[PDB]
Design an enzyme around this catalytic site. Structure first.
Site: not given
Ligand SMILES: CCCCCCCCCCCCCCCCCC(=O)OC[C@H](CO[C@@H]1O[C@H](CO[C@H]2O[C@H](CO)[C@H](O)[C@H](O)[C@H]2O)[C@H](O)[C@H](O)[C@H]1O)OC(=O)CCCCCCCCCCCCCCCCC
Ligand SMILES: CCCCCCCCCCCCCCCCCC(=O)OC[C@H](CO[C@@H]1O[C@H](CO[C@H]2O[C@H](CO)[C@H](O)[C@H](O)[C@H]2O)[C@H](O)[C@H](O)[C@H]1O)OC(=O)CCCCCCCCCCCCCCCCC
Ligand SMILES: CCCCCCCCCCCCCCCCCC(=O)OC[C@H](CO[C@@H]1O[C@H](CO)[C@H](O)[C@H](O)[C@H]1O)OC(=O)CCCCCCCCCCCCCCCCC
Ligand SMILES: CCCCCCCCCCCCCCCCCC(=O)OC[C@H](CO[C@@H]1O[C@H](CO)[C@H](O)[C@H](O)[C@H]1O)OC(=O)CCCCCCCCCCCCCCCCC
Ligand SMILES: CCCCCCCCCCCCCCCC(=O)OC[C@H](CO[C@@H]1O[C@H](CS(=O)(=O)O)[C@@H](O)[C@H](O)[C@H]1O)OC(=O)CCCCCCCCCCCCCCC
Ligand SMILES: CCCCC/C=C\C/C=C\C/C=C\C/C=C\CCCC(=O)O
Lengths: 6, 179, 39, 370, 185, 241, 406, 101, 40, 85
Positions: J38-40
Site C-alpha cells: 500500500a502506497d502512502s
C-alpha cells in the site's frame, strides 16, 4: 394573575 | 438498584454542587470590569454593587453534613447566613482540654493530607473518615495490608498527635535506690 | 508591560416589577371585540 | 564663549548626587498657592486669543490673503498651545488640586482638540521626568540620533542609502525638524495597544484614547462638512501645525545643546546633573509668555511638581538668584533655530559634540566599511 | 506571585455542548441509532451511550445555550415548526435525503483531502529540491476532521513550498465559541 | 476510584477559582471604597489564578518535569507564528485597517464630491472601530469583549445602512440606478462581522433577556422561582412546591 | 550663590533627615507602652475569647447551639507552650518558658512568611534531635526514650542531648533555637536570628546556660553587622528604653566582657550571671520584650539592592556580609567555651555541626521562603463575606418586613 | 424524540414567551389600546377616563405612571386625540392669562 | 504540628463547654494546612 | 474500557485486506502495510476506511507512526476504549 400561566 | 446516597464527599458535595449550579447562571465575568478601573488617578470613572458570592460552597456543605447526617444547598441557606450575620454585626483545665482537642484535630488532618496528597492526582483532596460497612467490606475482602494500615493511620493520627503534644506531669509533680 | 511598573509606582504614589403589560383576558373576553371592529 | 549660539547665560558645572526635588526647599510656600484670578486668566487669555482668531476667520474666510490667514492661524495655534499647557498642568495634578474631577475633565477637554490623551500624556511625561537626559530610555523627548545608530543604519543597511537614512536625512536636517512633535504624537498612541499598560488602568487608558477619538470622529467631520478642505486646512490643520511647532520648539530648546551631554545610566548620569544642569530655559517676549501660559518655564516645575503654572516665572527668578552659575538660559531668536536645524543634528556619544549629519556620516562612511 | 511556570490559561465555561459520542467529526452522517463501536466494547461498560444523551441534553447544559435573546425567540418558531408543525413522515423523507447528500459530500471531501495530500507532496518537493516527497498523514486526518483553520492551511502550504518540513505542523484550531451580543443573540 | 476523584478534583478547582475571582472582585470594590485594612496589597488583584490552584499546578509541573500581533519569521523558523496566542484578538489589525481605510475613503469621497455623509459616516465610524481595536489589544478581559462587540455593532450598522438605505453620494437619477445594493464597503464590513463571529465573541454572555417564569418552573430553588414570579408580575400565585 | 560644596551638604541634610524620620517612625510604637512588649500575653488573656463571627459558625450556633471561639496568637502560643518538643519534659521551667515565648513571637509576628528550614540541610542529617549515646541514628531518633541515662563513670556519662528548631522568613535567613541537656544538671538555650544578606539589620542572639537548675550565664544581644560595631539609632533607643523599663534596679555595669564578646557585642549588650529570682525574672522580661521589639521592627525592613546606578549599596552589602562572617567566625572560635559541651559527640562531628548548622555563612546560598500573605485575604473574606444579589434581595425583603412590623 | 428533548431543555424561556407572554401581555394590550383610540371620538372621557376605567376593571391594576398602559393611554389617547383641543383652549385662555404671547 | 495548631487556634474551634442539644475541614483551615505542607 | 482487541484486530485485518485486494490470511498482525505494498496515499485511504468502519476519530498525532496491523488495531482499540467517557 393566572395560575396556569406560571 | 439505586445504591445509597449518604456518601460524605462524592454524592453529597457533587450532588449539592450540581443542584446549586443548575438553578442559576452564576457567571460574573462582566463584574470583573472594576479590576480594570483601579489605577485611574481621579475620583471616579463603593456599595452593594458587589453581587459576587465570596463563600465556598464546600463550607455550607460541611455545615449541611454536620447537621442532618453526622435542607439542601440553595439560596435560602445563603440568605439565612447573611441575615444571621446582619443580626450579629479553673482555666488551666480549659487550656488542657482545648489543647488536646485542637491537637487531635490538627494531627488528624495532617495525617489525612500526608496520606492522600503527599504519596491526574493534581488538585489537593481532603479525604474523609467514617468508613461504612460497605467500605470496610471492600477494604477487608480486597486491597492489601498496606492499604488497610493506611486507613488505620488515618484513624489514629489525632490520638498520636495528642500523645506527642502532651506534658508529662510526673517530672513536675514528684520532688526529691532508683533515684 | 512597558509602563507596568511606572503605573504601579504612580498609582501607589511613589421598582421590583418589570415594565410589562397585564393580561386583559383573565376576566373578560370583551376586549376581543375591539379587534374585528377596528379591522 | 557660549553666546556664540544664542545660549546667553550658560552653566559651568554641577556636582552629582543631587535630586531636583531637593531644590524645592529653595522656593517659599507663597508660590505653592491657589490664585483663582491667575487660573481664570490662564484659561481665558489663550481662549480669548483663539476666539478672536476664529471670529476673524468667520469674518474673512477666503477673501483674505494667504499671509493674513497664516497670521490668524498662528494666533489660534499659540492660544491652543497655552490651553494645552493648562491641560498639561491638569495632567500633572497641579492646576486645581481642590477639584480632581474638574481638573481631569478640563484636561481631557483641552487635550481632545490636540488628539492627545491625558493619561498617556501624564504617563509619558512622568517617564521623561524620571529619565531626563538619559540615553536609550527616555524616548518621550528629543532623543538625539547617535553616531552609533547612524553607523548601524549606515553599514548594517549597506551603503549610505536606507529608509532610516533618508527619513532621518529629511527630518533632522530641515525645518520639518521643528514639527517633529507630529511624530511624537503618532508615537504617543502606543500603537493603540493596551498590553503596554497596567491591567488595572485599562478603562482609564481606553477613555483617554476615546476622548480624542470622539473629537476626531465628531468635531472633525463637522469641520470638513462646513467648508471642505479649504475650511479644514485654515480652521484646524494650520492651528494644529502651529501648536505642534510650539511644542517641538519648546521640547527641542529644553534639553538639547552642545554643552549638555546625554549619558546612559551607570555611565555617570544623575538626576540633578540632568535637570538643573541639563535644562535650557527659553525666554520669550511677555505677550508670548502670557499666551503660551508660561510653558517655557519647565525647570521650576521639574524641581517642584506641585508648583502651579502662574508662579513659575517668580519661582524661576528665585532659582536663578539662588543656584547661580548652574542654569542655562536662551532668548528666542533665529540663531537658535538655525543652529538646531543646520548644526546640531548628530550626537556622538564621546564628547557631546552635536555635529552636522554629513560630517559624522563622512566618518562612518569613508571609514568603518573602508 | 504564585506563577506556576506555564502562564495561567483561564478556563472559561463551555459555550457549546460537547459533540455527541456517536459523532464522526468528518462530515459523514452518523449512524442511525447505535454508533457501531459498542460491539467492539464490553457490555455494561457501554453505559456511556445514554450517559451522553444525559449531560448532552438534560443535566450538563451550558448556560450559554440557555440564554434568552431575540434571535433565539425567532429560532424557537423555526424549531417548533420543524418538530410539532411538520409531520414526522415528511421529516423522515427529508432526513433520508439529507443523509444521502451528506454521504455524497463526504465522499467529495475525502477525494479532495487525498488530492490535497498529492499537492502536499508536490509542494514539499518544490522547496526541498527532490529529497522530501512524502506527505503528513496526521495532517491528512486533520484536514479530514476539519481541525485546521484556513490560516493554518495556508501557513503549512507556504512552509512546504519554501522549506519542506512535512512533519512540522501548524497548531490545531480551537473550537469556535458561541457568539453572544447582549439581548440580540 | 478514578472518574470521581477526577470529577471531585475538577469541581474543587472550579469552585476555588470562582471563590478567588469573587474575592478579588469584592476586594476591588472595597479597596476602591477605602474600606480595606492597611495590609491589603491591590497588586494581589492582579493574581488571576486561585493561589491553591497555582500551588497545585506548581506541584504537578515539579513532579512531572506581516509583522502584526507579535513577531514574524517568514519561511525560515517558527512558520506558524500568526496562530500563536499573542494576547490580542485575531481581528485587531483587521478592524484597525478597516478603520483606517474607512476614514481615508470617507475624507477622500467628501473632498471629491461635496457630500457630507461620506465624512460623517466615515471618520465617525472609523473612530469607533479604532477604539474597538484598542480595546481588543488584550482580548482576555471585559474591555476585549466590549471591543469585539462594539466592532461587530459598527460593522453590522454599516452593512445594514448599505443594504437598506444606501449611500447619499451614490444617489442617481433612475430608481433602478439608486439601488442600495451591497458594494465593497458592505462586503468588507460583513466579512469583518463573520470574522468576529467565527473567531471569538463569547464573553459578556451573562447579559441577556431576563429569565422567564417558564425557566424556573422546574428549578429546584424556591427562592429563585419566587423571585422570578414576583418580578414578572405574578407574585401571589400559589407555588405548591 | 549656592556653591557645589553646599549642594552636596544639602543632599547630606535630606539624606540623613530621611534616616532620622524612619528611626523615630520605628521607635514611636514602643515609646508609649514598653510593657506592652511583655504583657501582651496577659493583655490578650484579659481580652479573652473572641466569638467567631463567620456565617458558618453563626449557622452552627443557630442550629446546633455550638459556639465557635477563637483566641489571639499570644494566648494561642501560651496554650501551646513548649509545643511538640521531643525533650519538652526534661528541660527546666525557665528554658521552657523562654522557648515558648520566643517561638510564639516567631509564629505570631512572622506569620504568613515563616517557613520551615529545608530538611536536606539540617533534618535529613538527623540534627533535629541528636543523642550522645546514639550518634549514628541507629534507633531512628528514638534514643531519648529507648536508651536509659548512663550510670556515673560508665561510658557515655554525661549524656548530651540537643534538639534544634530552624526556621526561615522573608527578612530572616535562619531563626535557630537549640536546646542542649546534660546529666550533670547543665542546660543550654541558644537562640540566634539571622537577617539575610540584603538587610542592614543586626543579628539577634541569646544564650542561657544553667547548672543544676540555677542560671549561671544569661546573655541577650542585638549583635551589630557594621564595620564600626555600632547599631542604628532605633536599635540603640529601643535597647536603652527596654533596659530602663525592665532592668530597673541591679548593678549598672554587669558586663564581664570575657575576651570573646568584644568583637561582636553591642554597646547595650546584656551578659549577666543571675543572682536571685527577681533578677532572673527581670532578665526574662527584658529578653522577651527585646525579641518582640526586634521582630516588630523586622516588619517594615526594606532590602538593600545594588548593581547599576550606585555602588554605596554594594558597599553596604559587602559590609553586611563581612559583619555576618565576623559574627559566625567569632562564634566558631568559641571552642574555649560551649564547644566543651560537645566533643562528647566527637570532634569531627562537632566540626560538621558547627560549620553547617547554627553559624553558617555563604554568599551563594539564600534559603527559599514562601510568603503566602493571602491567608489574610481568606480570613478577612470569611469574617466579612459577600452573599450575592439574591441574598441582597432577601435581606431587602426582610428589612422591609421589620420596618413595616416593628 | 432525543432532539425534541434537547431543544425543549435548551429553550425553556422562548416557549413561555410564545405561549403566555407574546399575545396576552405584549401584543393584545397594544392592539386593544390602539384600536380603542382609533375607534372612539376625540373626547376626554372616551380617550382617557373610560379606557382607564375599563383597563382597571379588566386587568385589576390601575394604570399608574409606572405602568405601560398609562403611557399608551397618554400617547395614543391624551396626546393624539384631546391634546390639540387642549392646546387650542390653553393658548387662547391660559397662555394670555399667564401674560405671554 | 505546632505551626498548624497555632494557626488553627486563631481561626476558631468548638470549645467543650457542653452548650449543645469535623471530617471535611473548612476552606481557610485547608489553605493554612496546604501552605504549611509546602516544604521544599 | 475493556475493548475486545481480538475482534478489533480481526475487523482491522478485514478492512485492510478488503481495501487492498489480499485475503484475510495475508493480513497478519505483525505484517507491515509496506509489505502489502500500500502506497502512502493508500495507507491514508486505509486509515480513512478504518475510521468509517469503526465510526471513531483516529488519533491524528501518531498516524504517521502506524506501521504494523497490530499497531493499527492497538491504536484503534485504544480509541474505542477512550470514546466512552
Ligand atoms: C424511499 C422514499 C422516497 C423519498 C426519499 C428520498 C428522496 C427525496 C428526499 C427529500 C427531497 C430532497 C432532500 C435534499 C435536501 C434536504 C432538505 C432539507 O431542507 O433538509 C431537511 C432537514 C434534515 O433532517 C434533519 O436534519 C437535522 C439538521 O441537520 C441539517 O439540517 C439542515 C438540512 O437542511 C441544515 O442544512 C443544517 O445545516 C444541517 O445540520 C438533523 O441533522 C438530521 O439530519 C434530521 O433530523 O430537516 C429539516 O430540518 C426540515 C424538515 C422539513 C423539510 C421537508 C423537505 C422535503 C420534504 C419532502 C416531502 C414530500 C413527500 C413525498 C416523498 C418524496 C420526497 C421528495
Ligand atoms: C471575502 C471578502 C473580503 C472583503 C473584500 C472587500 C474589501 C475592499 C476594501 C473596502 C473598499 O473598497 O472600500 C473603499 C473605501 C470606502 O470608504 C468608505 O466609503 C463608504 C461609501 O462607499 C461606497 O462608495 C465608494 C465610492 O464612493 C465605493 O463605491 C464603495 O464601494 C461604496 O460602498 C462610506 O460612506 C465612507 O465614504 C467611507 O468610510 O474607500 C477607499 O478608497 C479606502 C482606501 C484608502 C487608503 C487607506
Ligand atoms: C481591508 C480590511 C478588512 C476588510 C475585510 C477583510 C476580511 C477580514 C476577515 C479575515 C480574518 C482572518 C483572521 O483573523 O485570521 C486569524 C484567525 C485566528 O485563528 C483562530 O483564532 C481562534 C480565536 O482564538 C482560535 O485560536 C483558533 O484556534 C485559531 O485558529 O485564523 C483563521 O483563519 C481562523 C478562521 C477565520 C474566520 C473566518 C474568516 C472571515 C472572512 C470569511 C467570511 C465570509 C463571509 C462573507 C459574508
Ligand atoms: C488590509 C491590511 C491587513 C492587515 C491585517 C494582517 C496584517 C498583520 C496582522 C497579523 O500579523 O496577523 C495576525 C492575526 C492572528 O492573530 C493572532 O491569532 C491568534 C490565533 O489564536 C491569537 O488569537 C492571537 O491572540 C492573535 O494575535 O492573523 C490574521 O488575522 C491575518 C493573517 C493572514 C490572513 C490573511 C492574509 C493577509 C495578507 C496581508 C498581510 C500579511
Ligand atoms: C446577525 C444575527 C446573527 C444571529 C446569531 C448567529 C449565530 C448564533 C448561534 O450560535 O447560532 C445557533 C443557532 C441556534 O440558536 C440557539 O438555539 C438554541 C436551542 S436549539 O439549538 O434550536 O435546540 C438556544 O438554546 C440558544 O440560546 C440559541 O442561541 O443554530 C443555528 O442553527 C444557526 C442558524 C441561523 C444562523
Ligand atoms: C506648549 C505645551 C506645553 C507642554 C510642554 C511640555 C513638553 C512635552 C513635549 C514632549 C516632547 C515633544 C517633542 C518630542 C520630539 C520627537 C522627535 C524625536 C524623538 C526620538 O525619540
Amino acid at each position: 394573575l393566572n395560575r396556569w400561566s406560571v | 438498584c439505586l445504591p445509597n446516597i449518604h456518601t460524605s464527599n462524592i454524592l453529597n458535595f457533587t450532588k449539592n454542587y450540581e443542584i446549586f449550579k443548575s438553578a442559576k447562571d452564576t457567571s460574573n465575568f462582566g463584574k470583573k470590569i472594576i479590576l480594570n478601573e483601579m489605577q485611574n488617578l481621579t475620583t471616579t470613572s463603593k456599595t452593594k454593587r458587589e453581587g459576587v458570592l465570596t463563600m465556598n460552597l464546600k463550607d455550607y456543605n460541611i455545615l449541611l453534613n454536620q447537621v442532618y447526617f453526622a435542607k439542601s444547598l440553595n439560596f435560602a441557606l445563603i440568605s439565612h447566613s447573611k441575615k444571621l450575620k446582619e443580626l450579629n454585626v479553673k482555666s488551666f483545665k480549659k487550656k488542657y482540654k482545648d489543647k488536646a482537642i485542637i491537637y487531635y484535630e490538627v494531627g488528624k488532618f495532617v495525617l489525612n493530607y500526608f496520606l492522600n496528597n503527599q504519596l491526574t492526582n493534581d488538585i489537593t483532596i481532603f479525604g474523609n473518615d467514617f468508613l461504612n460497612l460497605k467500605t470496610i467490606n471492600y477494604l477487608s475482602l480486597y486491597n492489601s495490608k498496606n492499604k488497610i494500615l493506611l486507613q488505620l493511620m488515618l484513624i489514629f493520627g489525632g490520638k498520636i498527635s495528642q500523645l506527642l503534644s502532651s506534658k508529662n506531669l510526673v517530672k513536675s509533680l514528684k520532688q526529691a535506690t532508683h533515684l | 508591560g512597558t509602563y507596568y511598573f511606572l503605573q504601579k509606582l504612580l498609582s501607589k504614589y511613589l421598582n421590583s416589577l418589570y415594565f410589562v403589560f397585564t393580561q386583559l383576558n383573565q376576566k373578560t373576553f370583551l376586549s376581543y371585540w375591539l379587534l374585528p371592529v377596528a379591522g | 564663549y557660549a553666546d556664540e549660539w544664542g545660549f546667553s547665560r550658560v552653566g559651568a558645572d554641577f556636582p552629582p548626587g543631587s535630586h531636583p526635588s531637593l531644590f524645592s526647599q529653595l522656593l517659599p510656600q507663597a508660590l505653592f498657592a491657589f490664585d483663582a484670578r491667575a487660573a481664570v486668566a490662564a484659561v481665558a487669555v489663550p481662549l480669548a486669543a483663539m476666539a478672536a482668531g476664529y471670529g476673524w476667520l468667520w469674518y474673512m474666510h477666503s477673501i483674505a490673503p494667504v499671509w493674513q490667514q497664516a497670521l490668524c492661524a498662528a494666533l489660534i495655534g499659540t492660544g491652543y498651545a497655552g490651553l494645552f499647557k493648562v491641560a498639561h498642568e491638569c495632567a500633572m495634578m497641579r492646576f486645581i488640586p481642590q477639584m480632581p474631577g474638574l481638573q481631569a475633565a478640563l484636561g481631557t477637554l483641552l487635550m481632545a482638540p490636540a488628539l492627545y490623551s491625558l493619561p498617556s500624556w501624564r504617563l509619558h511625561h512622568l517617564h521623561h521626568l524620571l529619565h531626563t537626559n538619559m540615553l536609550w530610555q527616555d524616548v518621550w523627548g528629543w532623543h538625539p540620533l547617535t553616531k552609533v545608530e547612524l553607523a548601524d543604519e549606515m553599514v548594517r543597511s549597506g551603503g549610505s542609502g536606507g529608509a532610516a537614512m533618508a527619513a532621518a536625512r529629511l527630518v533632522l536636517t530641515t525645518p520639518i525638524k521643528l514639527f517633529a512633535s507630529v511624530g511624537h504624537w503618532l508615537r504617543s498612541w502606543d500603537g493603540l495597544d493596551l498590553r503596554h499598560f497596567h491591567p488595572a488602568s485599562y478603562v482609564e487608558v481606553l477613555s483617554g484614547w476615546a476622548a480624542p477619538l470622539a473629537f476626531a470622529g465628531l468635531v472633525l467631520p463637522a469641520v470638513v462638512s462646513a467648508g471642505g478642505l479649504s475650511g479644514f486646512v485654515s480652521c484646524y490643520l494650520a492651528p494644529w501645525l502651529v501648536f505642534h511647532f510650539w511644542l517641538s520648539v519648546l521640547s527641542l530648546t529644553a534639553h538639547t545643546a552642545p554643552h549638555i551631554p546625554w549619558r546612559a545610566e551607570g555611565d555617570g548620569w544623575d538626576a540633578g546633573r540632568a535637570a538643573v544642569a541639563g535644562t535650557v530655559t527659553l525666554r520669550l517676549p511677555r505677550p508670548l509668555e502670557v499666551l503660551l501660559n508660561n510653558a517655557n518655564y519647565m525647570l521650576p516645575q521639574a524641581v517642584a511638581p506641585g508648583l502651579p503654572m502662574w508662579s513659575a516665572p517668580a519661582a524661576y527668578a528665585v532659582l536663578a538668584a539662588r543656584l547661580g552659575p548652574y542654569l542655562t538660559e536662551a532668548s528666542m531668536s533665529l540663531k537658535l533655530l538655525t543652529n538646531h536645524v543646520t548644526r546640531w543634528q548628530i550626537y556622538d556619544e564621546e564628547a557631546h559634540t552635536y555635529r552636522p549629519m554629513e560630517e559624522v556620516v563622512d566618518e562612518i562612511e569613508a571609514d568603518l566599511q573602508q | 506571585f504564585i506563577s506556576p511556570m506555564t502562564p495561567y490559561v483561564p478556563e472559561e465555561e463551555p459555550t457549546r455542548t460537547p459533540p455527541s459520542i456517536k459523532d464522526t467529526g468528518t462530515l459523514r452522517p452518523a449512524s442511525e441509532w447505535y454508533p457501531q463501536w459498542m460491539q467492539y466494547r464490553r457490555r455494561e461498560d457501554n453505559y456511556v451511550f445514554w450517559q451522553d444523551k444525559f449531560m448532552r441534553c438534560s443535566t450538563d447544559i451550558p448556560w450559554a445555550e440557555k440564554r434568552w435573546t431575540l434571535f433565539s425567540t425567532v429560532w424557537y418558531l423555526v424549531q417548533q415548526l420543524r418538530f410539532v408543525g411538520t409531520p414526522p413522515a415528511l421529516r423522515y423523507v427529508a432526513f433520508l435525503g439529507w443523509r444521502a447528500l451528506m454521504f455524497q459530500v463526504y465522499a467529495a471531501h475525502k477525494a479532495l483531502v487525498l488530492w490535497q495530500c498529492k499537492l502536499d507532496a508536490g509542494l514539499a518537493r518544490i522547496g526541498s529540491g527532490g529529497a522530501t516527497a512524502t506527505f503528513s498523514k496526521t495532517m491528512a486526518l486533520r484536514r479530514l476532521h476539519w481541525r485546521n483553520s484556513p490560516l493554518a492551511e495556508a501557513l503549512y502550504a507556504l512552509n512546504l513550498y519554501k522549506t519542506g518540513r512535512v512533519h512540522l505542523l501548524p497548531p490545531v484550531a480551537k473550537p469556535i465559541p458561541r457568539p453572544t451580543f447582549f439581548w440580540l443573540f | 476510584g478514578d472518574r470521581m476523584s477526577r470529577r471531585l478534583e475538577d469541581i474543587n478547582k472550579a469552585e476555588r477559582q470562582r471563590v478567588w475571582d469573587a474575592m478579588r472582585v469584592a476586594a476591588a470594590h472595597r479597596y476602591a471604597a477605602g474600606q480595606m485594612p492597611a495590609w491589603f496589597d491591590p497588586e494581589w488583584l492582579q493574581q488571576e489564578e486561585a493561589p491553591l490552584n497555582a500551588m497545585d499546578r506548581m506541584r504537578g509541573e515539579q513532579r512531572r518535569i506581516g509583522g502584526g500581533g507579535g513577531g514574524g519569521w517568514w519561511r525560515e523558523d517558527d512558520p506558524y507564528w500568526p496562530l500563536r496566542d499573542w494576547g490580542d484578538h485575531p481581528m485587531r489589525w483587521w478592524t484597525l485597517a478597516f478603520a483606517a481605510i474607512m476614514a481615508a475613503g470617507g475624507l477622500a469621497t467628501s473632498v471629491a464630491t461635496g457630500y457630507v455623509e461620506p465624512v460623517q459616516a466615515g471618520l465617525g465610524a472609523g473612530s469607533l472601530l479604532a477604539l474597538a481595536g484598542a480595546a481588543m489589544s488584550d482580548a482576555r478581559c471585559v474591555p476585549g469583549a466590549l471591543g469585539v462587540k462594539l466592532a461587530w455593532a459598527v460593522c453590522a450598522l454599516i452593512v445594514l445602512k448599505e443594504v437598506s438605505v444606501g449611500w447619499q453620494h451614490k444617489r442617481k437619477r433612475r430608481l433602478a440606478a439608486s439601488a442600495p445594493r451591497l458594494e465593497l464597503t458592505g462586503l468588507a464590513a460583513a466579512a469583518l462581522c463573520a470574522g468576529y463571529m467565527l473567531t471569538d465573541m463569547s464573553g459578556l454572555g451573562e447579559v441577556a433577556l431576563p429569565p422567564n417564569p417558564g425557566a424556573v418552573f422546574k428549578s429546584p430553588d424556591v427562592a429563585y422561582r419566587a423571585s422570578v414570579w414576583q418580578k414578572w408580575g405574578y407574585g401571589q400565585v400559589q407555588m405548591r412546591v | 550663590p549656592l556653591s557645589p560644596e553646599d549642594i552636596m551638604r544639602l543632599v547630606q541634610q535630606h539624606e540623613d533627615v530621611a534616616a532620622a524620620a524612619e528611626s523615630e517612625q520605628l521607635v514611636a510604637q514602643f515609646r508609649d507602652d514598653p510593657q506592652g512588649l511583655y504583657e501582651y500575653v496577659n493583655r490578650a488573656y484579659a481580652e479573652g475569647p473572641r466569638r467567631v463571627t463567620t456565617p458558618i459558625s453563626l449557622l452552627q450556633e443557630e442550629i446546633t447551639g455550638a459556639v465557635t471561639e477563637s483566641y489571639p496568637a499570644a494566648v494561642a502560643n501560651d496554650i501551646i507552650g513548649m509545643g511538640s518538643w521531643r525533650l519538652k519534659d526534661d528541660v527546666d521551667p525557665v528554658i521552657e518558658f523562654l522557648v515558648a515565648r520566643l517561638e510564639g513571637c516567631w509564629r505570631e509576628i512572622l506569620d504568613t512568611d515563616l517557613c520551615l528550614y529545608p530538611r536536606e540541610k539540617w533534618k535529613e542529617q538527623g540534627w533535629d534531635l541528636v543523642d550522645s549515646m546514639d550518634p549514628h541514628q541507629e534507633l531512628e531518633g528514638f534514643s531519648y526514650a529507648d536508651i536509659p541515662d548512663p550510670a556515673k563513670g560508665e561510658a557515655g556519662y554525661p549524656r548530651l542531648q540537643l534538639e534544634n528548631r530552624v526556621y526561615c522568613s522573608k527578612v530572616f535567613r535562619k531563626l535557630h533555637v537549640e536546646v542542649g541537656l546534660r546529666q550533670d544538671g547543665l542546660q543550654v538555650l541558644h537562640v540566634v536570628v539571622y537577617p539575610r544578606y540584603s538587610y542592614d539589620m543586626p543579628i539577634f542572639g541569646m544564650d542561657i546556660v544553667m547548672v543544676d537548675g540555677r542560671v549561671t550565664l544569661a546573655v541577650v544581644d542585638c549583635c551589630p553587622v557594621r564595620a564600626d560595631l555600632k547599631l542604628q539609632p532605633h536599635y540603640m533607643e529601643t535597647m536603652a528604653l527596654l533596659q530602663r523599663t525592665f532592668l530597673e534596679g541591679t548593678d549598672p555595669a554587669l558586663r564581664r566582657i570575657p575576651e570573646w564578646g568584644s568583637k561582636i557585642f553591642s554597646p547595650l549588650a546584656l551578659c549577666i550571671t543571675p543572682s536571685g529570682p527577681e533578677e532572673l525574672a527581670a532578665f526574662a522580661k527584658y529578653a522577651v520584650a527585646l525579641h518582640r521589639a526586634y521582630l516588630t521592627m523586622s516588619l517594615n525592613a526594606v532590602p538593600v539592592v545594588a548593581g547599576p546606578g550606585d555602588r554605596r549599596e554594594a558597599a553596604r552589602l559587602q559590609e553586611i556580609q563581612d559583619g555576618q562572617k565576623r559574627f559566625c567566625d567569632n562564634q566558631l572560635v568559641n571552642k574555649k567555651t560551649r564547644r566543651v559541651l560537645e566533643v562528647a559527640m566527637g570532634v569531627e562531628w562537632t566540626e560538621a555541626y558547627m560549620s553547617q548548622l547554627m553559624f553558617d555563612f555563604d554568599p551563594k546560598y539564600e534559603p527559599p521562603y514562601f510568603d503566602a500573605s493571602f491567608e489574610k485575604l481568606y480570613t478577612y473574606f470569611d469574617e466579612n463575606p459577600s452573599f450575592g444579589e439574591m441574598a441582597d434581595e432577601a435581606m431587602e425583603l426582610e428589612r422591609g418586613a421589620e420596618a413595616e412590623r416593628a | 424524540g432525543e432532539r425534541i428533548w434537547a431543544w425543549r431543555n435548551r429553550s425553556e424561556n422562548e416557549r413561555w414567551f410564545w405561549e403566555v407572554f407574546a399575545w396576552d401581555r405584549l401584543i393584545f394590550p397594544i392592539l386593544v389600546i390602539v384600536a380603542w383610540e382609533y375607534l372612539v371620538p376625540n373626547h376626554l372621557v372616551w380617550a382617557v377616563l373610560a379606557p382607564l376605567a375599563l383597563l382597571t376593571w379588566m386587568s385589576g391594576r390601575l394604570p399608574t405612571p409606572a405602568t405601560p398602559e398609562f403611557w399608551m393611554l397618554a400617547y395614543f389617547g391624551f396626546y393624539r386625540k384631546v391634546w390639540p383641543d387642549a392646546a387650542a383652549w390653553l393658548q387662547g385662555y391660559v397662555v394670555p392669562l399667564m401674560g405671554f404671547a | 504540628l505546632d505551626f498548624v495548631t497555632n494557626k488553627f487556634i486563631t481561626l476558631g474551634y468548638i470549645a467543650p463547654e457542653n452548650a449543645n442539644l469535623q471530617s471535611e475541614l473548612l476552606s481557610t483551615k485547608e489553605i493554612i494546612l496546604t501552605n504549611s505542607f509546602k516544604r521544599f | 474500557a475493556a475493548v475486545d482487541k481480538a475482534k478489533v484486530l480481526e475487523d482491522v485485518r478485514s478492512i485492510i485486506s478488503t481495501q487492498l485486494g489480499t485475503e484475510l490470511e495475508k493480513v497478519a498482525p505483525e505484517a507491515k502495510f509496506v509489505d502489502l505494498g500500500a502506497d502512502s496515499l493508500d495507507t491514508v485511504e486505509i486509515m480513512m476506511a478504518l475510521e468509517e468502519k469503526f465510526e471513531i476519530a483516529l488519533e491524528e498525532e501518531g498516524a504517521e507512526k502506524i506501521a504494523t496491523v497490530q499497531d493499527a488495531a492497538d491504536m484503534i482499540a485504544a480509541q474505542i476504549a477512550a470514546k466512552g467517557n
